[PDB]
Amino acid sequence: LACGMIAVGSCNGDVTSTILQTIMEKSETELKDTYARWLPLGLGLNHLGKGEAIEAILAALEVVSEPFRSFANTLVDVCAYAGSGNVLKVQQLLHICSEHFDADMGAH
Amino acid sequence: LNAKVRLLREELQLLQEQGSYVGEVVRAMDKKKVLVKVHPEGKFVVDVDKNIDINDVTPNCRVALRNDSYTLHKILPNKVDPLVSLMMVEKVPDSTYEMIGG
Amino acid sequence: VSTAVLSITPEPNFQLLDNPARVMPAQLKVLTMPETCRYQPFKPLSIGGIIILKDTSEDIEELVEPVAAH
Amino acid sequence: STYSRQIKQVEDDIQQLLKKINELTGIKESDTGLAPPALWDLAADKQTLQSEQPLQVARCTKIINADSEDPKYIINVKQFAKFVVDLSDQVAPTDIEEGMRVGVDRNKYQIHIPLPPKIDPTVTMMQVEEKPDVTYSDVGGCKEQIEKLREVVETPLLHPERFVNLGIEPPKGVLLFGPPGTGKTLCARAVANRTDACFIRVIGSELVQKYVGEGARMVRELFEMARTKKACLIFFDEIDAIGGARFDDGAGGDNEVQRTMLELINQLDGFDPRGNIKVLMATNRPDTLDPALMRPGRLDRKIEFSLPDLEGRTHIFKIHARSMSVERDIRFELLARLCPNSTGAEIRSVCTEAGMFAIRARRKIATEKDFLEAVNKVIKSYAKFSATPRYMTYN
Amino acid sequence: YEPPVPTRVGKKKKKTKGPDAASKLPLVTPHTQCRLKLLKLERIKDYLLMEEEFIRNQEQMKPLEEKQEEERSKVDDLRGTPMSVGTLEEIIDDNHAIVSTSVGSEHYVSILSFVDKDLLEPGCSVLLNHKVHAVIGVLMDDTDPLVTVMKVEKAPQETYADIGGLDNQIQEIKESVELPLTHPEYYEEMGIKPPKGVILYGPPGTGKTLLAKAVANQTSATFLRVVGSELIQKYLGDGPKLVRELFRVAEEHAPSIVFIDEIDAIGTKRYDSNSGGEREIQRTMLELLNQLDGFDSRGDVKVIMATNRIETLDPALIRPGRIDRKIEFPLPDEKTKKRIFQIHTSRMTLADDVTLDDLIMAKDDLSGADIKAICTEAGLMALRERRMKVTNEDFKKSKENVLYK
Ligand SMILES: Nc1ncnc2c1ncn2[C@@H]1O[C@H](COP(=O)(O)OP(=O)(O)OP(=O)(O)O)[C@@H](O)[C@H]1O
Ligand SMILES: Nc1ncnc2c1ncn2[C@@H]1O[C@H](COP(=O)(O)OP(=O)(O)OP(=O)(O)O)[C@@H](O)[C@H]1O
Ligand SMILES: [Mg+2]
Ligand SMILES: [Mg+2]
Incomplete structure (x- = not known):
């Protein structure tokens, strides 16, 4: 969170490496903790409003486990297009809200 | 003769069916709803029988409502026009030009 | 439906009946066996019921295998 | 015009989409008072229709053998009947007192819930729910009047600690009197805007x-409902309607209205303590009020809204010409001098007419001449209809 | 036990009435047919296209019980039939209220979820289930017969062109009842609220009602007309109650223009049917004082009052803030009298021997009503003789009928 505030919207290379490093180093059970939700925000904060500079970052989020990957993929993608109004991105967002799950899998 | 006999036996059962209320239509509503005033029991919002056209349910019309569902099922003959009733109590003598002199 | 596209983006005239044949009371008047068959009914086949069939030939008798009751 | 063909194409699609959205969501009826389906909890409503039985409103009249373990309650079910019933097992015996409305079921009529006292719907509508858009900054020349008004009707509720420590009982009544247009209702509108307690406006x-x-009943229920609040404010605008002095003209002249005034006097200062109600009355005819109503303990403070002085009139001119498109050197002190005895209502009209002359001349800025003509039209030309000369004798 | 506490602030209904509901699409600017408007128009369409797809997907996998037509059908089952009409006495809680049926029996019933809760106010007509009496709807109150009396459904056919000589009077009355609505920017750029009230006073027949009729013809606002004598009621408090209800209809039909014609007739005429004497009239006036300028915030209501006796009014009634403008209607002069004769003889066919100059000096204190009365009686005289052309003899016998005898 803090490093995200210092490097908000800057796409700082150094913080991206370590935030990604921490995210995949944590365990499957460790990512279950809701405090783990903050690590994606730090990565998301760095790319606040940058736009399409995340496909490299989003590719890195592929390797991490579920359902944390789905949450991390959604969050950082959102902060990428903050204040952009890109309806195509909002189109994806509503599709994620479309499919309901009978909580743990629907945290994203 | 047989139908006359049959109608008589069924009449005894039919007479035991509860009678219909008499109400006055305030205003017709959407979805075949009507605002009526049952004589002693105030106002109701009622459904309309499938054999009664909602366009014929005019305001200030006398209607018959079912016992339990209060459903508008018959358009009773219209009551006395309030203007007519007002002119009965005033009772101004009717006149023509032939009965006026000078 | 997929995602919405945003701004940018010949009854036969006959039917053969095996033996035994479930024949209606009305089928009897219209049901008649083929001419070329080796069996010919003794009484008219429109009467119905159990009918004994004359054998024109003396070939191997192809019978109907009995079925056990349920 | 090049996009005219395409704009209508997308406008019609939006309307078609809007109607199609209403087909699935549902925006209709609204004449049987149906809420939009987003708030429809059908599953809960079905449960309420069975789990929660309806309760008939009844008033307890007497408790029989309250000391024993079999306390029996006589209830008056409005126009239905009177029943001797026992209390339900999901409410406490000490929660039901004689003379209090209760909710009873339809089967055994056992009391299920106590109910608030019955209040006339007209009396319920008297409490202010949306505060006015007027502050004390919109009242000019009433500096001493406002401080006296605030320290009785605002300060005790805002900071009650300053009065309990010194053993001070602040006044619970203020009478605002003055000629029409002097700011009596304007100050009360400022009070309601600023107040945090319940405000009840009673004309x-x-x-x-x-x-x-x-009429006396509504005064009783008015103070009954004011007492259901920790602190309350009742505003009696134009109290001369009912507050007139008692008299005997042989016939029963104003006997009924005098009883309403007698009820209001009783609630203000009678055998029972009034409560935390701080009343506030405004009238342009204070000479007509009864001596009992004009007595301390009912109207403790008598704040007079006299016509503004030169400093006050200049202040009211500044208030009303604040948002105007006036010129450079509008001599507002001179304009205040051209209307010696003029209410703040006339000053506001002078400001309105001054800009009204500018609109007449298709001019965007009001000059000093426009105000001079406005003073002539309002203060001078309209002096035939002036209510001031007749009403200073009354105040 | 503890009393239930509402979550809604207050006991009154929402002030907004008759809105666009959920059809309140964002206001797209500019109205000019340009790409920016096209881009904004597509922008609204894009979200709707998302909205259509999203809502359809949910309802597709929604249970058969939970469907838009099924839930509506379930609402009718919950409401039942018949639907009793009651009165809201008190809102005890958000989902609980005290209601009274037509027989006067009160019940402590539950407000169901589908009820429009922001239409709930004490004294309102509520719809209750026949069996359990639970609140199941609110009856949209029909237009009161009292509303129909005030409202002028069809604008009068009298225009400003049919008024002659009242050029200043039209100009002053337009600026307080017409200009603020047609061009409200003039008042906003100046920072002045429009003149609050207006009173039209003068001798009888001078055109006070006529100018109000011309105002009603060219107004986009609701026009309510009440004669001052109609405020004298047969029961105590009804007069004040009626003045209170008249401006309540004005509030609902905002913007509105209330025309209190013959306001002086409320006090200059004494009727034995008025139980309270001058004292009830005073209370009726005091209600009128509050409505014009009082504690309650006034919406877009412009008040026009007319009187031929302005000296008999309470001076506090027409004080500034209540009635800002006092427009006088003098008896016409020679130039105006000629115009009035031309106005009322325009559709006439006249004889070559008739002259309006001689008809000008029929009487020194000649009003427009007398001028019009001369014409209609002159035409009636021509009608008696089975003629379409009005002669000077017809006008001569016209003057001796209306002005004299
Ligand atoms: N002291 C003041 N400062 C500023 N504006 C004022 C002042 N006094 C009056 N006004 C203006 O004049 C108007 C007169 O209305 P107001 O409610 O104040 O009159 P009032 O004193 O209650 O009269 P009435 O006795 O006829 O009820 C106010 O709405 C306000 O715009
Ligand atoms: N200045 C005028 N121009 C044209 N017609 C006029 C004029 N003054 C009066 N009239 C005519 O006189 C008729 C009657 O007058 P009107 O009803 O307007 O009277 P008023 O001024 O309201 O007076 P009051 O109610 O005191 O009798 C109008 O219908 C109109 O045709
Ligand atoms: Mg006042
Ligand atoms: Mg008139």
Whole structure:
């Protein structure tokens, strides 16, 4: 969170490496903790409003486990297009809200 | 003769069916709803029988409502026009030009 | 439906009946066996019921295998 | 015009989409008072229709053998009947007192819930729910008047600690009197805007009722509902409607209205303590009020809204010409001097007419000449209809 | 036990009435047919296209019980039939209220979820289930017969062109009842609220009602007309109650223009049917004082009052803030009298021997009503003789009928 505030919207290379490093180093059970939700925000904060500079970052989020990957993929993608109004991105967002799950899998 | 006999036996059962209320239509509503005033029991919002056209349910019309569902099922003959009733109590003598002199 | 596209983006005239044949009371008047068959009914086949069939030939008798009751 | 063909194409699609959205969501009826389906909890409503039985409103009259373990309650079920019933097992015996409305079921009529006292719907509508858009900054020349008004009707509720420590009982009543247009209702509107307690606006003509004793009833229920609040403010605008002095003209002249005034006097200062109610009355005819109503303990403070002085008139001119498109050197002190004895209402009209002359001349800025003509039209030309000369004798 | 506490602030209904509901699409600017408007128009369409797809997907996998037509059908089952009409006495809680049926029996019933809760106010007509009496709807109150009396459904056919000589009077009355609505920017750029009230006073027949009729013809606002004598009621408090209800209809039909014609007739005429004497009239006036300028915030209501006796009014009634403008209607002069004769003889066919100059000096204190009365009686005289052309003899016998005898 803090490093995200210092490097908000800057796409700082150094913080991206370590935030990604921490995210995949944590365990499957460790990512279950809701405090783990903050690590994606730090990565998301760095790319606040940058736009399409995340496909490299989003590719890195592929390797991490579920359902944390789905949450991390959604969050950082959102902060990428903050204040952009890109309806195509909002189109994806509503599709994620479309499919309901009978909580743990629907945290994203 | 047989139908006359049959109608008589069924009449005894039919007479035991509860009678219909008499109400006055305030205003017709959407979805075949009507605002009526049952004589002693105030106002109701009622459904309309499938054999009664909602366009014929005019305001200030006398209607018959079912016992339990209060459903508008018959358009009773219209009551006395309030203007007519007002002119009965005033009772101004009717006149023509032939009965006026000078 | 997929995602919405945003701004940018010949009854036969006959039917053969095996033996035994479930024949209606009305089928009897219209049901008649083929001419070329080796069996010919003794009484008219429109009467119905159990009918004994004359054998024109003396070939191997192809019978109907009995079925056990349920 | 090049996009005219395409704009209508997308406008019609939006309308078609909007209608199609209403087909699935549902925006209709609204004449049987149906809420939009987003708030529809059908599953809960089905449960309420069975789990929660309906309760008939009844008033407890007497408790029989309250000391014993079999306390029996006599209830008056409005126009239905009277029943001797026992209390339900899901409410406490000490929660039901004689003379209090209760909710009873339809089967055994056992009391299921106590209910608030019955209040006339007209009396319920008297409490202010949306505060006015007027602050004390919109009242000019009433500096001493406001401080006296605030320290009785605002300060005790805002900072009650400063009065309990010194053993001080602040006044619970203020009478605002003055000629029409002097700011009596304007100050009360500022009070309601600033107040945090319940504010009830009562016009004296609202207390005049067709039937005998009905006007006094509304005064009783008004103070009954004011007492259901920790701190309350009742505003009696134009109290001269019901506050007139008692008299005997042989016939029963104003006998009914005098009873309403007698009820109001009783609630203000009678055998029972009034409560935390701080009343506030405004009238342009204070000479007509009864001596009992004009007595301390009912109207402790008598704040006079006299016509503004030169400093006050210049202040009211500044208030009303604040948002105007005035010129450079509008001599507002001179304009205040051209209307010696003029209410703040005339000053506002002078400001309105001054800009009204500018609109007449298709001019965007109001000059000093426009104000000079406005003073002539309002203060001078309209002096035939001036209510001031007749009403200073009354105040 | 503890009393239930509402979550809604207050006991009154929402002030907004008759809105666009959920059809309140964002206001797209500019109205000019340009790409920016096209881009904004597509922008609204894009979200709707998302909205259509999203809502359809949910309802597709929604249970058969939970469907838009099924839930509506379930609402009718919950409401039942018949639907009793009651009165809201008190809102005890958000989902609980005290209601009274037509027989006067009160019940402590539950407000169901589908009820429009922001239409709930004490004294309102509520719809209750027949069996359990639970609140199941709110009856949209029909237009009161009292509303129909005030409202002028069809604008009068009298225009400003049919008024002659009242050029200043039209100009002053337009600026307080017409200009603020047609061009409200003039008042906003100046920072002045429009002149609050207006009173039209003068001798009888001078055109006070006529100018109000011309105002009603060219107004986009609701026009309510009440004669001052109609405020004298047969029961105590009804007069004040009626003045209170008249401006309540004005509030609902905002913007509105209330025309209190013959306001002086409320006090200059004494009727034995008025139980309270001058004292009830005073209370009726005090209600009128509050409505014009009082504690309650006034919406877009412009008040026009007319009187031929302005000296008999309470001076506090027409004080500034209540009635800002006092427009006088003098008896016409020679130039105006000629115009009035031309106005009322325009559709006439006249004889070559008739002259309006001689008809000008029929009487020194000649009003427009007398001028019009001369014409209609002159035409009636021509009608008696089975003629379409009005002669000077017809006008001569016209003057001796209306002005004299
Ligand atoms: N002291 C003041 N400062 C500023 N504006 C004022 C002042 N006094 C009056 N006004 C203006 O004049 C108007 C007169 O209305 P107001 O409610 O104040 O009159 P009032 O004193 O209650 O009269 P009435 O006795 O006829 O009820 C106010 O709405 C306000 O715009
Ligand atoms: N200045 C005028 N120009 C044209 N017609 C006029 C004029 N003054 C009066 N009239 C005519 O006189 C008729 C009657 O007058 P009107 O009803 O307007 O009277 P008023 O001024 O309201 O007076 P009051 O109610 O005191 O009798 C109008 O219908 C109109 O045709
Ligand atoms: Mg006032
Ligand atoms: Mg008139």
